[PDB]
Design a binder for this molecule. Structure first.
Ligand SMILES: [Mg+2]
Ligand SMILES: [Mg+2]
Lengths: 436, 448
């Protein structure tokens, strides 16, 4: 919103005009009148935005040449050109050479303010998404998978991605889109698992809300693009039917709508269920299944690609540090082999969760110290007492204490009795009363 | 980006010109000439972008009134206006009423393409941000969390330097950003430097910037922070040579870039954070006390998760939805049984640790009946074993005690842990544990 803006123009009245409007708005303004004075200002402190006279006469660099030098020094620094009456061609060329936009003399305030609000807003947006975009394996299976993606992507066929939960099907779907002919169209996702079965039709098909406002459903939003249906198996009965029509008709009704909307979508499905078995029990539709499954893509379980795990661990650490400010640590080779040999029912999500867990537990140890196999949980390699009121908690505790002591004495009740502080028959009676 | 662009203009020749230039470029175009045709096209299908004649002669609604209706229907659908020579005041007014930008007749292709491309890009980024935000993944009504909000408010209007102090994985960065948002620098930059994360080799460059080999310049954080606030996350991990330089910056309000000679002037308000007291930093030996005092003119304490256990259910519930979006896992009800464990734990790693454990639970119950409650036996050792619990051969010190002594130790530990769980509220603790209030007071004295 407020910014340190540098105004470079060879005319005293323009610098004064621009600087004054921008200051009046809340910005901080600096001025220059040629290449040297502009580059000296930039050197003093990089500004947030630059207004640059496109001609800039009586200067060592013309306006475009200066633009080039600015962009070389600060690639991400937005620059809006100030152009003359009917120098549209030259202005347009400035944009090819790196300028964001231009404003044409003469102008009053509102026009300039708006040009500047836009340049800053878009610049800000570019930086938020660039950061967020920060926040792929050697094995046979993953080479086959890459190979599969590349063959299947440039077709126009519906894809069904199959594999277990957590194996990273969404990533495969985005890969497909990136190499498809719809790569510059939209990529829209529907988490069929996640959305309430009630709201599912509104997410898919949209609707007119009470105010007159419209919710554009995912099909409509995906027009010209790809729709990725995640875990198609969690789709309701009436919703399956209605998607079947869409695949064939290429048309649908909005919830509560009468208009039949035409779209041109390419659908990618995924599932970790066995759908053929769901057909057999009448839970999912056969005809729907076959149309969604024309070309299949299989995503390998972590256990199918064990070779990849070290680099995956290494990768998730780089990323977890980004996401949480924790200096990444080295994993010790005994613990790494235990990671490498687990079955990973939750696959990549599960592996990430565990790596994140180790980094949290070892946050604030000597950085040269290794993550050891001691730290991994019981799954790798009924009721809690705290949920119980006093009488019941104490009874759980007596029971489990007695069982523990009994095992520690190898089943010898008389020895257990003596140690725990009871007469033998009384231990037997107590054990029975606690349900053993 | 190719896109579905509706073109709305009362002149056949303008629609033709626009739709044709846009088509040559690869877009899919549709056209209309008045409100009824424009709204029917939007009802047939929602376009990605609208060009709209600012005047729109021969129409039920003029261009401005049509802009109100389009925006009401589709608030995020960008609309670029087509205006005439000298219509700037009206164009400006269109922007106030929701238009993204305008183009002024006469125009040829290049100029029209640029306006389209920009409008599509900006609209794309607005969505791609909010989408990437959901795909990455201050809550609470506790006494402590109310205190923190009240403190943020009292402190934000100062000009003075803030030191935020609190345990790791508490949400200190968020506290920083809530302070920035209520300050007089809310419209300036907020810049973060995580001292722990940056290799100390690169710490000077990250902070103070440098001229790279190409001629390309790297703007350091301090310089980027000009006009705003710079957040020095975990200052303790800063090298002494960097400490010395920050001290000069605080008082000179100036600095040299790595390898540079210009003294860059800046106007930054520094907010700092750490997990340790002053006594701690002296004993560690790393960090200068004079600097510490100057970075901590106004203190803000971020309470540990154990000091606000009352918020654990809201945070559990909150993190489930976050995770449910970020990872495609259906959110599930945590059983009251498992919530009691979660709530009773002291969370040495605070919000990060809690979140990571909620993620864990949700991954481990991924292929279950949607009704079936999440249970405590899926929690790791560090959560379950630090609390009063059913013993096991593993626990040498319980196993060395006879039954009554073991039981009495357990009652004590249990009651203290439940008191803590309910944030010290005796009445509620008593209600849960099965006791009347005075009886609970009397039992506590009887056990020490
Ligand atoms: Mg000039
Ligand atoms: Mg017209």
């Amino acid at each position: 919103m407020a910014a340190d803006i540098l105004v470079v123009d060879d005319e005293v009245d323009i610098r004064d005009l621009v600087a004054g409007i921008l200051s009046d708005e809340g910005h901080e303004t600096r001025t220059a009148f040629d290449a040297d004075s502009a580059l000296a200002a930039i050197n003093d402190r990089a500004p947030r935005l630059v207004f640059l006279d496109i001609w800039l006469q009586g200067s060592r660099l013309d306006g475009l040449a200066l633009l080039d030098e600015i962009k070389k020094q600060h690639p991400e620094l937005p620059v809006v050109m100030i152009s003359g009456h009917g120098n549209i061609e030259t202005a347009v060329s400035a944009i090819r050479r790196g300028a964001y936009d231009f404003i044409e003399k003469p102008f009053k305030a509102d026009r300039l303010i708006l040009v500047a609000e836009r340049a800053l807003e878009t610049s800000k947006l570019k930086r938020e998404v660039s950061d967020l975009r920060k926040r792929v394996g050697t094995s046979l299976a993953m080479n086959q998978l890459r190979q599969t993606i590349e063959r299947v992507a440039p077709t126009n066929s519906r894809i069904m991605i199959t594999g277990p939960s957590g194996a990273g099907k969404e990533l495969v779907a985005r890969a497909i889109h990136a190499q498809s002919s719809r790569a510059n169209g939209p990529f829209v996702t529907v988490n069929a698992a996640t959305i309430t079965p009630e709201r599912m039709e509104i997410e898919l098909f949209g609707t007119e809300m009470d105010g007159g406002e419209r919710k554009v459903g995912a099909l409509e939003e995906a027009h010209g693009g790809i729709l990725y249906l995640d875990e198609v198996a969690d789709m309701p009965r009436e919703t399956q039917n209605k998607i079947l029509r869409v695949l064939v008709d290429q048309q649908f009704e909005r919830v509560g709508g009468t208009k039949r909307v035409k779209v041109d979508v390419r659908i990618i499905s995924s599932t970790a269920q066995n759908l053929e078995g769901m057909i057999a029990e009448g839970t999912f539709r056969e005809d729907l299944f076959h149309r969604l499954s024309v070309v299949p893509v299989q995503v390998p379980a972590l256990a199918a690609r064990r070779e990849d795990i070290p680099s995956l661990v290494e990768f998730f650490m780089k990323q977890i540090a980004e996401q949480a400010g924790i200096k990444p640590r080295k994993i010790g080779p005994d613990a790494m082999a235990v990671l490498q040999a687990h079955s990973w029912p939750g696959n990549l999500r599960q592996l990430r969760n565990n790596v994140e867990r180790l980094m949290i537990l070892t946050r604030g140890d000597d950085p040269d110290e290794l993550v050891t196999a001691d730290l991994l949980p019981a799954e790798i390699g009924d009721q809690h007492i705290m949920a119980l009121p006093l009488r019941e908690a104490r009874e759980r505790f007596e029971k489990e204490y007695l069982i523990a002591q009994i095992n520690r004495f190898g089943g010898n009740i008389s020895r257990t009795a003596e140690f725990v502080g009871m007469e033998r028959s009384a231990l037997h009676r107590k054990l029975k009363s606690l349900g053993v």
